[PDB]
């Protein structure tokens, strides 16, 4: 029997700072035990300072990104070139995803950008459209490896102030873009070590009020 779904592997990761946000994703594309491409980007600039990635089944991922990019275009046409805010993008994507509730897009979706107060924003979706804003989210094949590391290093979970008898928590603070990129690079090198579908290259899209910047790094190719 024909199976309409497939698994193209890879993993993605979004972190939000005070006045910026990053959306990273490895560039490896796979089926079963074969590598299709060592450089196939899945993190996209969609306009209006919104970066997006839909990781899982690449055909559904590309379809969704394509539809959302198109949604941004028509939002401009219909509402006098108004900027699509990240919260409005999020709600719009929910309807895209839930529209196929009974034949789902097989993808974990993450978008990043800046909210209307200029602060960094990351939104994450399940395959059928439930969404939530967070400081932090890893998605895709190695999400289960990276996410607990992020809980510990971004949100300082399980970390207490030394000498306070485990009574005072380590206080929350925003991370600099330098610090965030260190965590992203360490997250992906760790994920590359222990997950077979993750590797080849890392592409990070950084979003500030000045626009979208890119950074590329090599990952292990085994």
């Amino acid at each position: 029997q024909f199976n309409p779904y497939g698994d193209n592997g890879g993993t993605i990761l979004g972190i939000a700072g005070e006045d910026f946000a990053v959306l990273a994703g490895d560039t490896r594309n796979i089926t079963d035990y074969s590598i299709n491409s060592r450089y196939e980007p899945k993190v996209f600039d969609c306009g209006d300072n919104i970066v997006m990635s839909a990781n899982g089944f690449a055909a559904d991922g590309d379809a969704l990104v394509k539809r959302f990019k198109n949604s941004v275009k028509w939002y401009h046409f219909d509402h006098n070139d108004k900027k699509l805010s990240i919260n409005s993008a999020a709600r719009n994507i929910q309807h895209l995803l839930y529209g196929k509730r009974f034949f789902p897009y097989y993808v974990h979706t993450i978008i990043a950008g800046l909210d209307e107060d200029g602060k960094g924003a990351v939104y994450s979706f399940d395959p059928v459209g439930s969404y939530e804003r967070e400081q932090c989210r890893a998605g895709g094949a190695a999400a289960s490896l990276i996410m607990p590391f992020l809980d510990n290093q971004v949100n300082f979970k399980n970390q207490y102030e030394p000498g306070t008898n485990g009574k005072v928590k380590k206080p929350l603070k925003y991370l600099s873009v330098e610090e965030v990129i260190k965590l992203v690079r360490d997250s992906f090198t760790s994920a590359t070590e222990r997950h077979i579908q993750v590797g080849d290259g890392l592409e990070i899209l950084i979003v500030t009020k000045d626009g979208v910047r890119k950074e590329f790094y090599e990952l292990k190719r085994d």
């Binding site: 929910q94 995803l97 839930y98 509730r101 009974f102 399940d126 059928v128 459209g129 439930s130 969404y131 939530e132 967070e134 289960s144």
Partner: protein
């Protein structure tokens, strides 16, 4: 999930956990399971996150359209029945929802309606919904009186979620509290189980099963 809402002398208490799961994978610990429909209506979410989140936000839009068309806030009965009639149309399709529509109106007073995805709609004073509903019931039933004070009712609701958060593997994160009065709903904070458990254990002397 564990969600509850009960009626009492001073109105309605609504309490929910904040965990989201995908199998045994803890997907989130900070999810909002109460949706504020209007200043007098609340909806609780249990079951499929997308199903709940999508259709209860949609419910909010229908309630807004009612008050525009009828120049009057929708009744809790009518609001719950919009949702129940909707999910009944999808009966068999595989929607998964256990919801509670809580609110106050003049004609009804404080009212709670249980609505689920197989089309069950029930008016009642106490309900617990979700995978940890039984754990919440155990504590809530055994401490419930109609004459509870607002302070005590808030704590019991909080303590019942904590009970379930602890025992049910698929509940946890934090407790979100709400109090519904004749004047509308009032938010009573997010309470992380990470700190709340030890605070309750110490102060209350309960949870003796746990290594102190």
């Amino acid at each position: 999930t564990t969600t509850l809402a009960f009626r009492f002398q001073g109105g309605i208490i609504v309490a929910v956990d904040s965990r989201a799961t995908a199998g045994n994978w803890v997907a989130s610990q900070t999810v909002k399971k109460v949706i504020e429909i209007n200043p007098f209506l609340l909806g609780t979410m249990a079951g499929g996150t997308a199903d709940c989140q999508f259709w209860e936000t949609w419910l909010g839009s229908q309630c807004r359209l009612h008050e525009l068309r009828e120049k009057e806030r929708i009744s809790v009965a009518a609001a719950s029945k919009i949702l129940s009639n909707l999910v009944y149309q999808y009966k068999g399709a595989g929607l998964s929802m256990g919801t509670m529509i809580c609110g106050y109106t003049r004609k009804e007073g404080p009212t709670i309606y249980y609505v689920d995805s197989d089309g069950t709609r029930l008016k009642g004073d106490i309900f617990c919904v979700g995978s940890g509903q039984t754990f919440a019931y155990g504590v809530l039933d055994s401490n419930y009186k109609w004459d509870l004070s607002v302070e005590d009712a808030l704590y019991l609701g909080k303590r019942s979620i904590l009970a379930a958060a602890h025992r049910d593997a698929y509940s946890g994160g934090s407790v979100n509290l709400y109090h519904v009065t004749e004047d509308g709903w009032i938010y009573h904070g997010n309470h992380d189980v990470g700190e709340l458990f030890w605070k309750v254990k110490e102060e209350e002397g309960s949870f003796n099963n746990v290594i102190g």
